Amino acid sequence: SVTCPGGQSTSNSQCCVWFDVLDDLQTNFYQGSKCESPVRKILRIVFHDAIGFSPALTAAGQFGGGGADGSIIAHSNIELAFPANGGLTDTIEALRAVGINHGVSFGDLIQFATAVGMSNCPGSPRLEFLTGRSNSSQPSPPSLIPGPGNTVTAILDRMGDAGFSPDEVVDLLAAHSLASQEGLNSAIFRSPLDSTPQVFDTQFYIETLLKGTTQPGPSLGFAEELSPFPGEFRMRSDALLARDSRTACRWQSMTSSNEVMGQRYRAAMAKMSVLGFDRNALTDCSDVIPSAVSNNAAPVIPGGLTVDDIEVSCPSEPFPEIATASGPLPSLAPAP
Numbered sequence: 001s002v003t004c005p006g007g008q009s010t011s012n013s014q015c016c017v018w019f020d021v022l023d024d025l026q027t028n029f030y031q032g033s034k035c036e037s038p039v040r041k042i043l044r045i046v047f048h049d050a051i052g053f054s055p056a057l058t059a060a061g062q063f064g065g066g067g068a069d070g071s072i073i074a075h076s077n078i079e080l081a082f083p084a085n086g087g088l089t090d091t092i093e094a095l096r097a098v099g100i101n102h103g104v105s106f107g108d109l110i111q112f113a114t115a116v117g118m119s120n121c122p123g124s125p126r127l128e129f130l131t132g133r134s135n136s137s138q139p140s141p142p143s144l145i146p147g148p149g150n151t152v153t154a155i156l157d158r159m160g161d162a163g164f165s166p167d168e169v170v171d172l173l174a175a176h177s178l179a180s181q182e183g184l185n186s187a188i189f190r191s192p193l194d195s196t197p198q199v200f201d202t203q204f205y206i207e208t209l210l211k212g213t214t215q216p217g218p219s220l221g222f223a224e225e226l227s228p229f230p231g232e233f234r235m236r237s238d239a240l241l242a243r244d245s246r247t248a249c250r251w252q253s254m255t256s257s258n259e260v261m262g263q264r265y266r267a268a269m270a271k272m273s274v275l276g277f278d279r280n281a282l283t284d285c286s287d288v289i290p291s292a293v294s295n296n297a298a299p300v301i302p303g304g305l306t307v308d309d310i311e312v313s314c315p316s317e318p319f320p321e322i323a324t325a326s327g328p329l330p331s332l333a334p335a336p
């Protein structure tokens with residue numbers, strides 16, 4: 001059966017080169033298989049690469065984008081000029097080098113580095129990984145990336161054109177559980193979007209629902225809203241989506257189970273990884289992806305706050321029974 005040069009066993013011979021890029025990335029790009037800034041930047045990158053895909057542009061006789069084709073690396077010179085692609089240069093160049101050095105397509109590489117980065121963060125599911133996307137790409141059309149100051153209708157329409165339902169938009173946002181911002185408000189560099197920027201968990205959903213009480217920096221930044229405790233940043237699109245009637249019940253259902261949240265995120269991400277491709281034409285190499293350590297902590301309403309502080313926005317389903325903590329309000333340190 002197929003054992004690779006290193007003795008590991010896989011489903012197909014096309015998977016063997018990925019054990020090598022797995023060692024490179026873990027040792028170098030992830031600095032000893034860590035869950036820090038490199039994993040966070042790659043998650044913005046996989047999204048901005050795959051979402052440059054528009055059926056509506058195709059239908060209007062215009063090039064609509066190749067989707068998850070790695071065009072953000074190949075055509076970095078035009079894509080990184082886009083409003084949503086700031087602060088990605090250093091990460092795009094380190095990935096370009098692993099791509100050229102191992103002979104793999106940029107589109108596959110972005111998807112692989114996402115599944116490998118996530119396995120370094122506790123609580124993560126094992127993402128599916130498929131190989132075989134062609135390395136040729138055209139530059140993505142401009143303006144296909146949702147922005148933090150857009151209304152909910154604008155975000156749902158763009159995402160709906162790419163193929164996601166309102167529920168999948170909420171599911172995809174579980175990645176803001178491993179997140180911070182650097183360019184919305186530079187005065188509070190790397191301010192976390194939830195209290196556990198290194199744990200893939202339910203806290204992001206709970207904490208964006210909390211009453212915005214605190215201005216974390218000396219002034220408000222682009223599309224910044226008051227957050228529930230010092231050090232945490234709250235982005236206007238995340239505040240709006242937690243509260244809008246079209247997405248509020250899915251958002252609420254994500255607050256109490258890390259199992260359900262992970263299951264749904266893995267499904268939405270498998271769908272995003274093949275935008276512009278035929279899944280059936282790719283080779284499954286998911287067994288190359290290692291398991292992440294399990295997260296054993298239970299969901300909590302932090303720092304003494306209670307259900308009275310969460311702005312319940314699903315008129316049908318009552319808010320889940322989530323534990324409370326007898327804390328003083330936390331002050332979050334920048335994400336590492």
Ligand code: HEM
Binds near residue numbers: 041
């Ligand atoms: C509804 C659309 C979304 C909007 C408007 C949005 C917007 C943003 C913005 C403005 C930032 C801050 C970047 C910075 O200044 O450093 C951010 C960070 C982040 N976003 Fe999103 N996001 C959305 C969806 C997603 C999706 C689907 C993913 C990927 C699965 C993603 C992954 C991340 C991650 C992990 C970070 C943290 C980056 C870091 O800490 O350096 N986002 N997002």
Ligand SMILES: *[C@@H]1O[C@H](CO)[C@@H](O[C@@H]2O[C@H](CO)[C@@H](O)[C@H](O)[C@H]2NC(C)=O)[C@H](O)[C@H]1NC(C)=O
Binds near residue numbers: 073075096103104106
């Ligand atoms: C994928 O396509 C890109 C070109 O778009 C290739 O990238 C170049 O590779 C050469 C050496 O192989 C480098 O010296 C260039 O600087 C690279 N250009 C860019 C824009 O990165 C890449 O080699 C191709 N990969 C595969 C597996 O065919």
Ligand SMILES: [Ca+2]
Binds near residue numbers: 052070
């Ligand atoms: Ca692309």
Ligand SMILES: [Ca+2]
Binds near residue numbers: 203
């Ligand atoms: Ca988290």
